[PDB]
Coordinates of N, CA and C and ligand atoms in Angstrom, one line a residue:
X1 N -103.6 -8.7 -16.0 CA -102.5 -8.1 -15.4 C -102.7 -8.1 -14.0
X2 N -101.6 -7.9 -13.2 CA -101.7 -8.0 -11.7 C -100.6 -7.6 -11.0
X3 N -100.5 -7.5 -9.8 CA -99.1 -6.9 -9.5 C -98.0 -7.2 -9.8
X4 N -97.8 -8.8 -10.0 CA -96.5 -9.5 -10.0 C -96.3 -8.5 -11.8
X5 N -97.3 -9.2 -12.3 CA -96.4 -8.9 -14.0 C -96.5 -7.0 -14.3
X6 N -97.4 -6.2 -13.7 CA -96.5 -4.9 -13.5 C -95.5 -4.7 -12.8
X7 N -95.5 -4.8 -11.6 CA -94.2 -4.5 -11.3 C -93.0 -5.3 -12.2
X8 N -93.0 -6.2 -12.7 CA -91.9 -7.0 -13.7 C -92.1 -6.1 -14.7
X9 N -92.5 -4.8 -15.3 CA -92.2 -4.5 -16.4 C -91.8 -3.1 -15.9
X10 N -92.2 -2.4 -14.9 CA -91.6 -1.3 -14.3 C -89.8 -1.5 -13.8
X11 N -89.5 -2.8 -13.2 CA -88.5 -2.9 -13.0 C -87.7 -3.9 -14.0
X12 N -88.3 -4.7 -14.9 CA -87.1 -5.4 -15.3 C -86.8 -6.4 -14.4
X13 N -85.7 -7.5 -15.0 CA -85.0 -8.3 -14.5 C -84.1 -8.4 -15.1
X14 N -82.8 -8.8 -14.2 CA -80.8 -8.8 -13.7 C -80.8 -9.6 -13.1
X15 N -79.9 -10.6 -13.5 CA -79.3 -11.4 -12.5 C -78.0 -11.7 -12.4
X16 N -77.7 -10.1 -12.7 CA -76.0 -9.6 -12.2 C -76.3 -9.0 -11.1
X17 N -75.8 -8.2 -9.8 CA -75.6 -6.9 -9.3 C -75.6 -6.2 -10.4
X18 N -76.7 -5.1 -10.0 CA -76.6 -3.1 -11.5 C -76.7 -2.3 -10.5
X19 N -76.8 -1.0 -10.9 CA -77.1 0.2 -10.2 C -78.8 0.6 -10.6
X20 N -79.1 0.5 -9.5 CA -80.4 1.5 -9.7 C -80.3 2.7 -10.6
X21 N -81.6 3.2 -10.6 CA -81.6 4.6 -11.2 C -81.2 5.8 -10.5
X22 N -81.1 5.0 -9.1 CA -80.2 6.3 -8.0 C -78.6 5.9 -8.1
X23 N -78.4 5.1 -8.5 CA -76.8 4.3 -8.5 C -76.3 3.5 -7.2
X24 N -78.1 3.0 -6.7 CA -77.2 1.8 -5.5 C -78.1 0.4 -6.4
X25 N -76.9 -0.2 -5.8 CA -77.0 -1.6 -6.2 C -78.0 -2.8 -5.8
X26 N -78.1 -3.3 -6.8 CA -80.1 -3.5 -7.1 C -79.7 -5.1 -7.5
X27 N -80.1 -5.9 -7.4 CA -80.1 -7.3 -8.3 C -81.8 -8.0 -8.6
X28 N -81.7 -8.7 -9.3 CA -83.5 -9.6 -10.0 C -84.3 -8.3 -10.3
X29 N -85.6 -8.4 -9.3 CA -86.6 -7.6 -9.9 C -86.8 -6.3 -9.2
X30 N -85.9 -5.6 -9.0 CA -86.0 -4.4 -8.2 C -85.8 -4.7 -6.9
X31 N -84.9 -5.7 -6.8 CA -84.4 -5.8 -5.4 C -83.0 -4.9 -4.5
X32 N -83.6 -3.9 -4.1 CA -82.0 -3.0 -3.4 C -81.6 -4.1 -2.3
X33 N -80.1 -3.7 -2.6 CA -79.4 -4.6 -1.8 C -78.3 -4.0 -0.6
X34 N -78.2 -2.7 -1.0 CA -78.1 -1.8 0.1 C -77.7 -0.2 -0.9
X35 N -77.3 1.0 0.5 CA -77.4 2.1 -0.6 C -75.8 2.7 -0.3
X36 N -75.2 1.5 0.3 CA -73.3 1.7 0.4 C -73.1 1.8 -0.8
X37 N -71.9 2.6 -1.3 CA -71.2 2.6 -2.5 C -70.0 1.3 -3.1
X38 N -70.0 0.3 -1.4 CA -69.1 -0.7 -2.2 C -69.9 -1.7 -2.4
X39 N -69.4 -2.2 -3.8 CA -69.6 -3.7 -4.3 C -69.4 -4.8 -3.4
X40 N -68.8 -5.0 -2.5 CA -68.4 -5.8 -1.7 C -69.6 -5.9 -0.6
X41 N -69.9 -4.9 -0.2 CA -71.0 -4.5 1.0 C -72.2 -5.1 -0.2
X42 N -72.3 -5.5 -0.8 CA -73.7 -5.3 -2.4 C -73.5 -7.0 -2.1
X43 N -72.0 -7.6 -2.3 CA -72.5 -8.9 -2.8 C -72.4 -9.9 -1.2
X44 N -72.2 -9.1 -0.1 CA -72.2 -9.6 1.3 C -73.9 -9.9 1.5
X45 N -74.8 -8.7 1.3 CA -75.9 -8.7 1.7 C -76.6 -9.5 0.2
X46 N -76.0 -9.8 -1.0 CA -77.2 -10.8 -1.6 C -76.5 -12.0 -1.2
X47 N -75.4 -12.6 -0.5 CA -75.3 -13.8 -0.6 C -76.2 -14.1 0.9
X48 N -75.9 -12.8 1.7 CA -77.1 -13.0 3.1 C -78.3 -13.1 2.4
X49 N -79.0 -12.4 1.7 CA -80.4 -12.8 1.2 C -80.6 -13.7 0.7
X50 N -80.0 -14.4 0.2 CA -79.7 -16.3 -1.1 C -79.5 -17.1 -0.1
X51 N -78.5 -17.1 1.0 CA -78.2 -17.9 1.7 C -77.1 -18.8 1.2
X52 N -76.3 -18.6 0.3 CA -75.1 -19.1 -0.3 C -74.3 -18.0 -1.0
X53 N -72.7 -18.9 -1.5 CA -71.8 -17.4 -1.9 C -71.9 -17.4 -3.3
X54 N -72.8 -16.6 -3.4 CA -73.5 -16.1 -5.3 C -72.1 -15.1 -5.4
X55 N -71.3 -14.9 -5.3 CA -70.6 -14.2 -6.4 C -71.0 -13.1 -7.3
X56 N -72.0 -12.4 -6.7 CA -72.6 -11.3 -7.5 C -73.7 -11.9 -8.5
X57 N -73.8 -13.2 -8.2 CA -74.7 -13.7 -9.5 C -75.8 -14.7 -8.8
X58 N -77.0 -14.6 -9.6 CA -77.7 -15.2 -9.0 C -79.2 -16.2 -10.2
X59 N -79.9 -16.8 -10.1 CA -80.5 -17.7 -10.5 C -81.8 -17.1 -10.9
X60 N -82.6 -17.4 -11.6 CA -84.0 -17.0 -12.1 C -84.8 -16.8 -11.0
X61 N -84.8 -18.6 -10.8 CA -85.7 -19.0 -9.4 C -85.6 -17.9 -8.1
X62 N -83.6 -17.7 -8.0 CA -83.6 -17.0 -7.0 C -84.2 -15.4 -6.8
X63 N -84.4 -15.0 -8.2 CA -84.7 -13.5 -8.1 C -86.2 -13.6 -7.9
X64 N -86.8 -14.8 -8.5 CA -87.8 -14.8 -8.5 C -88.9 -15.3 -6.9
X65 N -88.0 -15.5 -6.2 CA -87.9 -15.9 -4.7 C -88.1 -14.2 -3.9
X66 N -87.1 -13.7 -4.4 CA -86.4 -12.3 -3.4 C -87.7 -11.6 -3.9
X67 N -88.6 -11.7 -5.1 CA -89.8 -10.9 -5.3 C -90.6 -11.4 -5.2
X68 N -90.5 -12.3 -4.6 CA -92.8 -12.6 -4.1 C -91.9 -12.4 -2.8
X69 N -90.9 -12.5 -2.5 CA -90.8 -11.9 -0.7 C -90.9 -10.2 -0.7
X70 N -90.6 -9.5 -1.6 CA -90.8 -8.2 -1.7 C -92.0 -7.6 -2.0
X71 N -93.1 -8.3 -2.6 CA -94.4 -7.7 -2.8 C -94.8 -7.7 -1.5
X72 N -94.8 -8.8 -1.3 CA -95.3 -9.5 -0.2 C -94.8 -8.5 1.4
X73 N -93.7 -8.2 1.9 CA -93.6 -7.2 2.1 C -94.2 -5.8 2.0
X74 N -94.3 -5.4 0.7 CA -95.0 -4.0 0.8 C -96.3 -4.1 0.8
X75 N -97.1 -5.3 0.9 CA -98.4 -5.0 1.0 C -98.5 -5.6 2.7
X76 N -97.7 -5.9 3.8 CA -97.7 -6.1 4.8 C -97.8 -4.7 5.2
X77 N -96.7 -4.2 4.7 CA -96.0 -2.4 5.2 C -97.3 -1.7 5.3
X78 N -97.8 -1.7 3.6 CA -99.3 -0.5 3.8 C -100.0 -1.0 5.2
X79 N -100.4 -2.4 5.3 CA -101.1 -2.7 6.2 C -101.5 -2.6 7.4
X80 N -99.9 -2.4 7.9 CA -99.6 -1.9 9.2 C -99.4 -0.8 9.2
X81 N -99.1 -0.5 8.4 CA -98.8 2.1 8.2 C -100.4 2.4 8.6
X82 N -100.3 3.2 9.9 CA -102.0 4.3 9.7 C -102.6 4.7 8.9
X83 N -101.2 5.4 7.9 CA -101.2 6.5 6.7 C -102.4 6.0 5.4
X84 N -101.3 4.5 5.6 CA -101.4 3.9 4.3 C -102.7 2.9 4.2
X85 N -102.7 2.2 5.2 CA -104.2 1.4 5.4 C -105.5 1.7 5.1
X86 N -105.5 2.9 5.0 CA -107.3 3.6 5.0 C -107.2 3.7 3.8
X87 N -106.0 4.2 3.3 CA -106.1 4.6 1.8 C -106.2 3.5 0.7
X88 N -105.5 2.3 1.1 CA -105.6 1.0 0.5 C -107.0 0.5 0.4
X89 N -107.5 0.4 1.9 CA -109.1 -0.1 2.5 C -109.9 0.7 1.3
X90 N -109.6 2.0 0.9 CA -110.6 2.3 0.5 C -110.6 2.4 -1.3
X91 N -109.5 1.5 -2.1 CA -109.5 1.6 -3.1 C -110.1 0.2 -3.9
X92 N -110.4 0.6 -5.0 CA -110.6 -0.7 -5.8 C -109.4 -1.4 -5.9
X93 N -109.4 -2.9 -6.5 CA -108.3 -3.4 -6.9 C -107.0 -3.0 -7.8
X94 N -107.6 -2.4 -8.6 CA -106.8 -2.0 -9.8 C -105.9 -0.9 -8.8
X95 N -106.4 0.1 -8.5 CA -105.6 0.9 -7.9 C -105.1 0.7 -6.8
X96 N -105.3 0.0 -5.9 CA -104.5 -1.0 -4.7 C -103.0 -1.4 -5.4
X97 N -103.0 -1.7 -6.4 CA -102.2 -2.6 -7.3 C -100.9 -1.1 -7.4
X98 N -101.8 0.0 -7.8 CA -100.6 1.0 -8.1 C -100.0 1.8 -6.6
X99 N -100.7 1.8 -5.7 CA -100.2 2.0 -4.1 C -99.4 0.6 -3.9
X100 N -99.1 -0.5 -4.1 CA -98.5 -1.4 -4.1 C -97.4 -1.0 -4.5
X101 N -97.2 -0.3 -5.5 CA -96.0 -0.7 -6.7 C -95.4 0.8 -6.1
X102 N -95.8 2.2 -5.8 CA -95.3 3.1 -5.2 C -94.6 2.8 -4.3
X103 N -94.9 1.9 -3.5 CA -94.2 1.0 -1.7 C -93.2 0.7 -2.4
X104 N -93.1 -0.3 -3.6 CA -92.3 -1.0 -3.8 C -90.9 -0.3 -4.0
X105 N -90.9 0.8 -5.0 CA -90.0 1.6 -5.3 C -89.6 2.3 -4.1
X106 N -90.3 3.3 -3.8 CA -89.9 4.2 -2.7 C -90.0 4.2 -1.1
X107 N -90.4 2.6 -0.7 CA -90.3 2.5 0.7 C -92.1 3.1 1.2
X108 N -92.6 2.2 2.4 CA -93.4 2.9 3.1 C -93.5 4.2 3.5
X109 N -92.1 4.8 3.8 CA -92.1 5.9 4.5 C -92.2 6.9 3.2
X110 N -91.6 6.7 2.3 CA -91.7 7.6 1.4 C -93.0 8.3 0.7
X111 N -93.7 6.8 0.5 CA -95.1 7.1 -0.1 C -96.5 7.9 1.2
X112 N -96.0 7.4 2.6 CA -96.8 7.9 3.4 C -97.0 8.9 3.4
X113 N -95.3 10.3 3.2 CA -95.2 11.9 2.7 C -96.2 12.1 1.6
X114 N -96.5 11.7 1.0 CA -97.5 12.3 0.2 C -98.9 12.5 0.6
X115 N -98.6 12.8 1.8 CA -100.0 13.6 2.5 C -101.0 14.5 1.5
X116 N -101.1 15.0 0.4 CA -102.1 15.7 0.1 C -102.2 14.8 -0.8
X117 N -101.7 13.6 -1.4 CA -102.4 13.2 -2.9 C -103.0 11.8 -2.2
X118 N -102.1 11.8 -0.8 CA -103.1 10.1 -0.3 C -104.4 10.8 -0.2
X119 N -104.7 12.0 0.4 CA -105.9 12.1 1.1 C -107.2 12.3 -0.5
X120 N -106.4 12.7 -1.6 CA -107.1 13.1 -2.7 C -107.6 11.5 -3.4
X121 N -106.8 10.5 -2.7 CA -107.2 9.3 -3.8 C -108.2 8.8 -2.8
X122 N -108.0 9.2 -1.2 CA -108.8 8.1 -0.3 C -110.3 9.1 -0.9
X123 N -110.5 10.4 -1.4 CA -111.9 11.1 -1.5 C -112.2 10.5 -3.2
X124 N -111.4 9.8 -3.9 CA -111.9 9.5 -4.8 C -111.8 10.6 -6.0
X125 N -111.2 11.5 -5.9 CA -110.5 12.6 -6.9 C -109.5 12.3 -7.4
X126 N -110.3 11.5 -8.6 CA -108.4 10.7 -9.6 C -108.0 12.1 -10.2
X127 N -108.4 12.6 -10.9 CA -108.0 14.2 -11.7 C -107.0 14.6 -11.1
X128 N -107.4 15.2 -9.7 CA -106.5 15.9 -8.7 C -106.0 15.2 -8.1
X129 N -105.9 14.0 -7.8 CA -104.7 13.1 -7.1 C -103.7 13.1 -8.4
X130 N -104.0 13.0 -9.6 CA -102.8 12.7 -10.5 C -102.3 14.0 -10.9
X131 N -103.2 15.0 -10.7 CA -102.2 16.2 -10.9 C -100.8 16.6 -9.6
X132 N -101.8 16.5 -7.9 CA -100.5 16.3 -7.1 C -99.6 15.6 -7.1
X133 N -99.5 14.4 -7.3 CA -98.9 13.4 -7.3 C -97.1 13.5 -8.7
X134 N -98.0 14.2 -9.8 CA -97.0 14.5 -10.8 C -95.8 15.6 -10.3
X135 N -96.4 16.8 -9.0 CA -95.2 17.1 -8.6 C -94.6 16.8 -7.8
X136 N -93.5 15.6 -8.0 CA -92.8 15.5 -6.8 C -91.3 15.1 -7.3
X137 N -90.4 14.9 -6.2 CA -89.1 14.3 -7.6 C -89.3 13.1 -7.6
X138 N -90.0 12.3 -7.8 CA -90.9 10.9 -7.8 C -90.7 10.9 -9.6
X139 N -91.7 11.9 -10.1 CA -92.3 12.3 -11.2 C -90.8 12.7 -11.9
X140 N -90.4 13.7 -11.2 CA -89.4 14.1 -12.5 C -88.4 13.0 -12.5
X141 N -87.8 12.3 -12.0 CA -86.8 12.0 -11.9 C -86.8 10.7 -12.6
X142 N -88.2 9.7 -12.1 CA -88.9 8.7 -13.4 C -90.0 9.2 -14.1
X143 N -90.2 9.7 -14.8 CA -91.0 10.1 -15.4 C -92.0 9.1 -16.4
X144 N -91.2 8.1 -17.1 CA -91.9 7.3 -17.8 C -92.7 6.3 -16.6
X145 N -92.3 6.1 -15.8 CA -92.7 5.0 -14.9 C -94.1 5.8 -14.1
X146 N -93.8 6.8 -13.7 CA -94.7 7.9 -12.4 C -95.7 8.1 -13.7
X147 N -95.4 8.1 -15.0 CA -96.4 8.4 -15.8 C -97.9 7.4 -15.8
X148 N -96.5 6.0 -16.0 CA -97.8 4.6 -15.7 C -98.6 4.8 -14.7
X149 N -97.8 4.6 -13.7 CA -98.4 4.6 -12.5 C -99.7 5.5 -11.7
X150 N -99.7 6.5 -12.5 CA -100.5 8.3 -12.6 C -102.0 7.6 -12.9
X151 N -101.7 7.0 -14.4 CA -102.7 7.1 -15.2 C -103.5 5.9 -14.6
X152 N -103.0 4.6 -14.2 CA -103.4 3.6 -13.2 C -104.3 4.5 -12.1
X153 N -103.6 5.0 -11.4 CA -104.5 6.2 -10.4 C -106.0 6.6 -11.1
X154 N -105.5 7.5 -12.1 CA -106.2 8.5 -12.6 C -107.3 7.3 -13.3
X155 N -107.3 5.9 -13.9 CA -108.3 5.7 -14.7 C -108.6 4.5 -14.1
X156 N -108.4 3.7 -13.3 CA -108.7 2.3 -12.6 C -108.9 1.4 -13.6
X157 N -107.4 1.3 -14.4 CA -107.9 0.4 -15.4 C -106.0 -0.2 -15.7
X158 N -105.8 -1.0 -16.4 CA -104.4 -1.0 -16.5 C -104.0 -0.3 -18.4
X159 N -104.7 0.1 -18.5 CA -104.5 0.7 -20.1 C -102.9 1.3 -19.8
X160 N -102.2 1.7 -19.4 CA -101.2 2.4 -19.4 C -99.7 0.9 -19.5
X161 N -100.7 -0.4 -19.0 CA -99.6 -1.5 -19.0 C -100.1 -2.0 -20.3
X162 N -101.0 -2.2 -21.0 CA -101.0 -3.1 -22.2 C -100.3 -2.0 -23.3
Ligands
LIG1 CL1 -83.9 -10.1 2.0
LIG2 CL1 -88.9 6.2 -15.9

């Protein structure tokens, strides 16, 4: 397992325009395309990201393009975040992999707010990082997903993806 093929099973693949689980429009592998409510404004910015007039529709290859530029991405973001860097620096692989996938869904800035459960994973307190970390609307709102992702934390192992 590795980041590309969990994150592929947390999000799935579309290669229509759908709605996220917030109801903005998303296309391939967890790619947001903006958080306007029109479709029009949705299929202006994927044909800006394809670089042709996809018509709301788009190609394997291509979704699969828009996500090694999106990993790829969030592990630049931690890189450069203060927040986020020490706490990456100081994890094993396995759990790098689920600070990865956190970026991915909810933005740098998002995951950086979790000031008491970063500082519980950078001390190496899986228990009590995955108990903070469960309250948040993170947790309630995906819960099957925040569950994976927890246990990733909590056990440095990917048991929660096989
Ligand atoms: Cl893009
Ligand atoms: Cl979920």
């Amino acid at each position: 397992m590795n980041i590309f093929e969990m994150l592929r099973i947390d999000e799935g693949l579309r290669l229509k325009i759908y709605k996220d689980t917030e109801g903005y429009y998303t296309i391939g592998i967890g790619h947001l395309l903006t958080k306007s409510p029109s479709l029009n404004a949705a299929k202006s910015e994927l044909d800006k990201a394809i670089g042709r007039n996809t018509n709301g529709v788009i190609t394997k290859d291509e979704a699969e393009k828009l996500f090694n530029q999106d990993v790829d991405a969030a592990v630049r973001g931690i890189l450069r975040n203060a927040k986020l860097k020490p706490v990456y620096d100081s994890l094993d692989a396995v759990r790098r992999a689920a600070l990865i996938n956190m970026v991915f869904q909810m933005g740098e800035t998002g995951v950086a707010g979790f000031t008491n459960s970063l500082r519980m994973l950078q001390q190496k307190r899986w228990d009590e990082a995955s108990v903070n970390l469960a309250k948040s609307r993170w947790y309630n709102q995906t819960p099957n997903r925040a569950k994976r992702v927890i246990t990733t934390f909590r056990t440095g192992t990917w048991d929660a993806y096989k």
